[PDB]
Amino acid sequence: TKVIFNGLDVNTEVQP
Amino acid sequence: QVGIPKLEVDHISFSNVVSMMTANIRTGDDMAVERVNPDDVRAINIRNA
Amino acid sequence: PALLRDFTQVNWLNRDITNMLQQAGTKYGLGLTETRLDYVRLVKTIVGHALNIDHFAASVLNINLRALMEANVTADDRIKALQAHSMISTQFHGPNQGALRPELAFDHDHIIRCLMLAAANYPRLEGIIVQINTGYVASANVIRPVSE
Amino acid sequence: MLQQPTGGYTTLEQFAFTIRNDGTNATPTQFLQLLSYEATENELVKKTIPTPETHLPSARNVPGNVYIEDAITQALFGISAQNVNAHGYFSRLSALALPNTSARLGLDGVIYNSETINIPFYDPAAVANFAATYAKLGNASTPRYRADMIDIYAHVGLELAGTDAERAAGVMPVKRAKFDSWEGSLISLSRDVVNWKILAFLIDLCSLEGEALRAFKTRNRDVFRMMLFIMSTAVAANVVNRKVTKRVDRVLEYIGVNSMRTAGRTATITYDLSRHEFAAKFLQLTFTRWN
Amino acid sequence: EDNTLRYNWMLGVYARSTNYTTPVGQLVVNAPAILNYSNPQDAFNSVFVALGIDYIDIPITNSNIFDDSSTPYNVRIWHAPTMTEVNHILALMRKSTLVSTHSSWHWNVLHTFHYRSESDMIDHFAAKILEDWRQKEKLDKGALVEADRVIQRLIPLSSSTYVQRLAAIGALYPNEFTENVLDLSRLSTALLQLSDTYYQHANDQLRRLYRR
Amino acid sequence: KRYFPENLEQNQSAARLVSAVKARASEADISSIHLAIAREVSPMFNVHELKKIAESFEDPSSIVVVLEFILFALFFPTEFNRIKGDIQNVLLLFFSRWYPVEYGIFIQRGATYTINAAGEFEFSGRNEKWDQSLYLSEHFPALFSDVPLAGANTIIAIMRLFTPQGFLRTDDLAIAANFPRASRNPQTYIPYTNQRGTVTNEFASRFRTIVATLANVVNERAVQDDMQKATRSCTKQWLRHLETQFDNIAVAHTDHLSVVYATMSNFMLNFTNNFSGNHATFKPDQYVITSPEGSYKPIIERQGETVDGLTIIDTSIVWPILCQCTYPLVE
Amino acid sequence: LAGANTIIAIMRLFTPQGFLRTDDLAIAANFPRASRNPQTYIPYTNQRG
Amino acid sequence: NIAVAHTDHLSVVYATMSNFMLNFTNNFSGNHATFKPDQYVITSPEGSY
Amino acid sequence: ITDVDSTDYGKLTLRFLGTLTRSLKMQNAQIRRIRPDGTVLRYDDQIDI
Amino acid sequence: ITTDYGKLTLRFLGTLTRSLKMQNAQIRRIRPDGTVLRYDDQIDI
């Protein structure tokens, strides 16, 4: 279910 | 009356000022940046833009 | 040989250091000298230390830190290259950091000048360029061989 | 809280512009005598200079304080590779342009929000005119504002290498300038001219009046022909050094004609795309004030 | 209804020719009233702000109906309103393959030429340089001309090496008219010989000018 | 769950409009609802901005995004003032891609103005993005100006459906008991009055007018290729159903919930003014703690997000409070 | 040619259908490019509507 | 039947390709009549290239 | 020493940076009003409370 | 004197040769046939 969250999201990782 | 650069003279000097770095400045890590897919592939425009 | 200006028993040497060091020409220092503050965050970042190394080694260490701090490119100009590897109409929302994450710039020349020199020496080099490419199109499900 | 007697801060020993060469330290005047040049037949003619646009950028609210001075030099004569700088806190200047402001501009090259304890600063009245002209340097990369990075350079070469017999007619033959050198040369003058206190000069240009402007321009037409030479080798097409028997000359390809990329690479100072727009915005803004 | 409106042909017809598949043609589908302009330049300006695009490129039209071959070059229209803008595109136009612009412009917007192969540049560059040598014939004697632009001669921005020898020999109007010159055919060869001529001879500052 | 309902989702014209509303849904988390009601009055110190969405307005079924920013603007007129610029940035795509002609003449004028000159407006003739960083300066988002426009009355029209509701009141039950206020004068928004007649309810009728004029924008968008003609008809079964659901809430929304803010406006601790009854002109007027001996500390600053749920305001918390929420229905 | 207009007719039938889409986001990201300016040739269009 | 996918799907996987790293050459194919690739020999003062 | 807890006095914690600390040495900190620029204005007589 | 996904490729590569005398090696472009062109300006990067 589409749950309401506030802050920014976490997914893929950037890299040096 | 200025400072003569010591990188060009003979006699070796000891105890110069070195530009350090505090703990704040972190280098070479990760960002938890997220993606958002184009949702539909059919209405994508590479033609011009 | 200056930090001992008043700690040695040897009498002749003591008066001589406290004369050429006391001189209106030179001066000795040690420790924290000055601080460079931050613009938006307002915290101490680049601190100068009157260290105790030599001029030959300290010169080299300053070339590195200056090239890291004068790059002017934050770790956020990383997602603009991370996006060139996906569907043309995709986008990101960067976790803004700014000056607290300085990153050295991506070399334009040294890479293209080297990837050209390596291309002639090892002519099999294209093997893992046509191979990295074929691993991408296979991962995007465009053609599946059914039987007719 | 220094003041000017209309001699100007340049009529002072507090800060003086001196190049180091020849095993000892010398004034700009002594240096330039070594620059000897010939002609290669491509007429570099003086065009007109278009007036700047009055609109001043807004100093977006910023806590803390940036070293406004740093960047002015760190872009023009910056030696160490400078990355993109079209972006930045480069227009906090305009926050001094308004009448009653408390924000003060110290010595050394900082811009304080509130005058603090124990810090010597320029006179609050004569730093106002300096801003209503140079804060305009904020919009240096805004499209539809940027200057043109070609024609101004014609103006530049007629300055450091133009014998008066030529400037009085507005036309001169493209020159190839070579002086005698030492080791690092071109890179060494850069690491040198950088720490010069440029603000101690520019303030004088917008204040000092006809009495002490004709006299000011006569003693300083050389401190200008010094930070104009280095700024030029960041443009020239070649830097190849001719050889005598034991002597070495630093022939410079084409001073006063602007190409797009440095001859130095490794031998001299280098510009970048983001800096080409910047040098044109400075060189244009300053010439109207000078000339 | 308004009498002070002109229909935009060039851009409008081309968009229909591609079935509006391209966004520059898909924009004219929804609101076809975007083509009705009262003032030149303002015609294109609206087709830039409503897209976010910087430039639109149009493949050239061929007058012959049966010569169904590939196009030699393709024109490109940039978004540029003010004078200080023109200096930006032309300076950025350096370090980029082989491109051409020429003196003035039609609709008050700058548009550059893009050539396919180097060999298919000199044949177009000489087809202009011939035309100019005629416009300065009637002008040199005094008459009534109409060719809008004054100078037809193309200007080589980023270019090869043959066009440098070809551009200098066109920007001086050689006496060779009374033609002699071996003008008829194949023209891109005998003209290229005359370039070497003015060079090593003939002559004094006429070499100095060709070498300038 | 009952906001994509009414039966008749077993129609193969809805299938597209089906998932668009479903992938825009949130769940009735008890705490998440309370945080929206409390943020309306509580003073802030960090300049929060919305959880940004990337959506190119392709089909007539993409009106479900612009309608979300309408409903977020009513129930919360304050809290909408702070984000009026970042919500504007994603709204310009609806005025450019959806219908192209009117944006071309609006951006010709400019995207930002300054309120100064002791009055009047100074529109800057240039296109620029918002970013939210320049919130606390002399820059108001020019799409919320109200200024009668030259050649796009068509846009300056719907650009009025964000208008603030109710009245502004000078809270006295705080100033009469000497509670410390950081503003010179204690003020607030309400933000939508209460019942006045017998069976009228003007707040429900105001929304009915929005639905009426917002329907024509959808029932005019000339589309092609047919699939949007399928969703162009089956969108009114969502556009009209939702307005009927609204007239079943407004009574218990502008009476029992209206008296809640009326009292909460004048608490002990609340002191600053977060009023927003005029989106054309309003600024924070922040203070600073400064010493003549080199010190600088502001009250409101850009930093974010902090390790607290008081930055990035979720705009999806609108659909659960229209459907999965029983009120006391006015024990 | 002046004679055979049939051998040349079947050859204007081999003409490709594409456009030179110069790509910004590859060079805006700052990547290695050996040519003066980058270029490619995709072989299809869109026909979205 | 192939015309649908070969235009709005197999064309998206191509537009992405020209943006990858390690790809630095121009394989321009429009107009077969006049196209030659570029030779980039590594030359040395002595020896062979 | 007096029971008054200090969970995090004098520092700001961003979730994507960690824990940054400020200084606590003010002097004659007279709370005054900021102008849009950021420069300190004046008392603001007739307003400010 | 001085896993890496690259060490798998360093082995796959033909590193077992590398016999090219590069004293003052330079990057240039031979003409259609075989004559090393001078460094041009506009065509070369």
Side-chain angles (χ1 to χ4, degrees), chain E residues 129-167:
Chain E
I129 213 97
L130 193 287
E131 254 185 351
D132 187 355
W133 282 0
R134 293 274 183 86
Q135 197 176 146
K136 205 223 173 292
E137 191 77 55
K138 286 89 178 290
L139 289 176
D140 206 21
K141 280 167 78 276
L144 286 311
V145 314
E146 72 282 301
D148 78 292
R149 77 227 295 98
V150 87
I151 301 152
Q152 292 273 11
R153 292 190 297 99
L154 284 156
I155 303 308
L157 272 54
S158 297
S159 60
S160 60
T161 180
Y162 272 88
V163 278
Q164 266 81 305
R165 183 142 73 255
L166 195 72

Side-chain angles (χ1 to χ4, degrees), chain D residues 11-25:
Chain D
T11 169
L12 224 70
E13 76 318 300
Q14 207 272 71
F15 22 42
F17 325 86
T18 48
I19 67 139
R20 108 167 314 281
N21 70 319
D22 85 17
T24 53
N25 155 20

Side-chain angles (χ1 to χ4, degrees), chain B:
Chain B
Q1 42 175 225
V2 286
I4 179 160
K6 65 206 259 183
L7 231 174
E8 50 87 51
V9 281
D10 298 57
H11 44 295
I12 312 152
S13 183
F14 278 61
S15 74
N16 36 230
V17 181
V18 184
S19 286
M20 298 192 71
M21 173 202 289
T22 197
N24 269 57
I25 306 300
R26 302 189 57 80
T27 50
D29 302 75
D30 286 272
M31 283 155 55
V33 77
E34 34 55 70
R35 296 211 319 276
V36 51
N37 289 312
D39 102 78
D40 73 310
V41 81
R42 286 201 49 81
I44 292 173
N45 47 298
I46 76 286
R47 194 73 172 82
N48 190 219

Side-chain angles (χ1 to χ4, degrees), chain C residues 40-42 91 93 96, chain F residues 52 54-55 296 302-303:
Chain C
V40 60
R41 246 75 180 179
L42 217 152
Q91 46 202 198
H93 310 299
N96 289 310
Chain F
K52 49 197 76 181
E55 201 78 45
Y296 214 97
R302 227 284 269 183
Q303 300 169 19

